[PDB]
Amino acid sequence: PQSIDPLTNLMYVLWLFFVVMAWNWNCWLIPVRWAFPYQTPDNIHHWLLMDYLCDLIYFLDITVFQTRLQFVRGGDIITDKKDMRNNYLKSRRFKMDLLSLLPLVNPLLRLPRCLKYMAFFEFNSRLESILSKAYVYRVIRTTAYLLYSLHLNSCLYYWASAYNSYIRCYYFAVKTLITIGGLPDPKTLFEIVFQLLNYFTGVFAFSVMIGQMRDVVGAATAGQTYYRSCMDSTVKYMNFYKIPKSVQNRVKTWYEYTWHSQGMLDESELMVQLPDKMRLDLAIDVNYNIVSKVALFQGCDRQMIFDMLKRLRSVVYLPNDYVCKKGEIGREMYIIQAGQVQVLGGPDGKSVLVTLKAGSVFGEISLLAVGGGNRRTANVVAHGFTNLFILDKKDLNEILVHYPESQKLLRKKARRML
């Protein structure tokens, strides 16, 4: 990669994870070396070797990774070194990267090495975008923050103790996270100010833990709560008006099938939050092939097809549900997106004259009637649950007034057929 893009091509995410591990080393292993005596002369070379490895990772990220990042200027992707280097230099990220490698035996000289926190936030955003159920990683990240707060408290307690032995100070830090009693009693105003500050910081960490857990629970169960509230409102409405249990059970069964299959309970309310180009290109990659397969819409303008694609509403039909009865008015074009549909024949119905699978279109001739001319010539039932994309005749009428040539051609088709 002569110029890596920060969004995709997850090798950059792997390198940024390595930078995050280096920054986590510079965050965690610095106070435990400042307070606790694991920076002995016997193993000083290991600490210096790993610290210099982290510094090399920092310098490598500054030089050969952050410089060759594709960047958008005026909305255009820009992928040349002479502009990427200047764009990186102008950013605050390079300022923090330079400040995080200022060289100043004391590990507090490596205190600015923890100042590369923008790389951690970028890696957090990328790991959130990569994997579904990102609330698990949010829980892990908040837990890591609380462990780091307890680690800093443990190092501070060990440093103040002189004025394993690490897990003991950690136990004292967790025990005094929301408790001030474990700490020794204050005889001055200054000491009670720091004791109150310690208590408040620990309670802030604990309440961030609790609030992030509440946030994760609410976000992970927001859709379930919304679906349950909608179902309970519908059930309360049907119970208020004394709806019999057959229609209530049909409405319920529709609710569980729509929630388990679609997972949103309304696809149309999601589309209106998308850009119109998103809506159009999503309607193309779902129904354009099926709509363009029919011979009634062949030879028509592509924009008329595109406009009918936006107005195609997805409706779920329960098992053994009459999509259109014999003699019922015809004003819709049913496109079987999924499921089995049965056109019935024989004596008194109940015999499948023909069955149609997903991707077939029937009832389009009902789109061309004027003044309710078309009647459904055969009984049609839904074999099992089926998702049909439906276009109303009125919706076609609103579409056709914007395309006079297409409307005239479709009216010629209507005159030729019927």
Binding site: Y171, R214, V217, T221, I243, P244, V247, Q340, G384, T386
Partner: protein, 454 residues
């Protein structure tokens, strides 16, 4: 024979397999750690483990029997169901739960129940049952509290078992932190063992609780691990309960936000005090009778067939009693009944006055109305549920002496919940039935000629 997942037999089997899964999850580690629990009740544990294994095999059989939906249709072919079950990770977990690992009792002694921990791999069936009955139960919050309580009980019990195991490994009575000597007359009892370990794990999963401090580094590491595990678990529990309280108070908060917004608007726009008393009384009526949400936002996700079915089952007997809609096609009745939108009128409200536009037909679903004079003191005739008016105002009748005008004053005697059908809604519903359009025109013609309004 195929058991559908959305039925009740699948629910009963989910409970009947959850009971051995719960027994395993709460007793395998208990018998593994507390040796007297395993040893003293050996025969009972053997019988219960054999029962759990039999129910595990029957659940594996049910997994083959249960039918997934393919193209919205339930699969009843045996080979397809078996392949769908075996392709998933659940089959691997089920077959790993049923290794013949009870034969290690001969090779490890009767005091090693940790060999049966593979039966814990049926946790997914327990979670499936819990999430199925969370939606099924009438009280979701109460059962969610029950699940949270059961989860913390299981976690506290597991920490108690691990604490007893660590005290066994370190040595009983070796430190003031471990469980005391089991040669004591009062501390050697198995009931005292488990219950004191449960109390210790209760004190240790919360940092606030005071326990004898750890002595050596292993105890400190274990106590820190319990501290952070309890932080995670109890933060999750408090977040769950806070989310429940937010959910149960969300409707009240939305209603109170609407009420306060309307109060702020009336104070801002200097609305007269009697009118704001009327508005607040209306809102108290709405909250008292639990009518805060309108049916437009209730039946908004339902399909046209289901909204139509509810509309028939509410208004067909009322709408077919109308003279004009008597000899009408049922399809027009279905199309028209979807457009009946409700309006609720306070007592003393004038639905329509003489001199107003007739563009809506009002059907009294619930409530009593009255035809009153201009002063409104006297009542001409009372109307109850099942009645209708405005039938000729919406009908475009040419040459009417009193066209598009209310010929009487309608006053709401009480809180009347009545459904209006707009004139434009009916004319847009009549673009599909021109024969019914001229039929209704003829009906209005004879109605107006009966009363001489032409």
């Amino acid at each position: 024979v195929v058991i559908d997942p959305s039925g009740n037999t699948y629910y009963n089997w989910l409970f009947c397999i959850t009971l051995p899964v719960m027994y395993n999850w709460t007793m395998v580690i208990a018998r593994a750690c507390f040796d007297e629990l395993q040893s003293d009740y050996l025969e009972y544990w053997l019988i219960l483990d054999y029962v759990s294994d039999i129910v595990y095999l029957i659940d594996m059989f049910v997994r083959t029997r249960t039918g997934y939906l393919e193209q919205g249709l339930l699969v009843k072919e045996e080979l397809k169901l078996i392949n769908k079950y075996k392709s998933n990770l659940q089959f691997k977990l089920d077959v790993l739960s049923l290794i013949p690992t009870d034969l290690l009792y001969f090779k490890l002694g009767w005091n090693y129940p940790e060999i049966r921990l593979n039966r814990l791999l049926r946790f997914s069936r327990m979670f499936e049952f819990f999430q199925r009955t969370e939606t099924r139960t009438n009280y979701p919050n109460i059962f969610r509290i029950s699940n949270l309580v059961m989860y913390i009980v299981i976690i506290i019990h597991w920490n108690a078992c691990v604490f007893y195991s660590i005290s066994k490994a370190i040595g009983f009575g070796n430190d003031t932190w471990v469980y005391p000597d089991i040669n004591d007359p009062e501390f050697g009892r198995l009931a005292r063992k488990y219950v004191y370990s449960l109390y210790w794990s209760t004190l240790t999963l919360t940092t606030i609780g005071e326990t004898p401090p750890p002595v050596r580094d292993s105890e400190y590491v274990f106590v820190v691990v319990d501290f952070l595990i309890g932080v995670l678990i109890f933060a999750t529990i408090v977040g769950n309960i806070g989310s429940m309280i937010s959910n149960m108070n969300a409707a009240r908060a939305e209603f109170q936000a609407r009420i306060d917004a309307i109060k702020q608007y009336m104070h801002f726009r200097n609305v007269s005090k009697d009118m704001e008393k009327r508005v607040i009384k209306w809102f108290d009526y709405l909250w008292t009778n639990k009518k805060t949400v309108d049916e437009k936002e209730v039946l908004k996700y339902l399909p046209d067939k289901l909204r139509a079915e509810i509309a028939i089952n509410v208004h067909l007997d009322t709408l077919k009693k109308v003279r004009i809609f008597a000899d009408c096609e049922a399809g027009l009745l279905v199309e028209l009944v979807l457009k009946l939108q409700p309006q609720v009128y306070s007592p003393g409200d004038y639905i329509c006055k003489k001199g107003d536009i007739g563009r809506e037909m009002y059907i009294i679903k619930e409530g009593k109305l009255a035809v009153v004079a201009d002063d409104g003191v006297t009542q001409f005739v009372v109307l109850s549920d099942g009645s209708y008016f405005g039938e000729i105002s919406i009908l475009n009748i040419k040459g009417s002496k009193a066209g598009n005008r209310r010929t009487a004053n309608i006053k709401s005697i009480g809180y009347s919940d009545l459904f209006c059908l707009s004139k434009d809604d009916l004319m847009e519903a009549l673009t599909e039935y021109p024969d019914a359009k001229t039929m209704l025109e003829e009906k209005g013609k004879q109605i107006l000629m009966k009363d001489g309004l032409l």
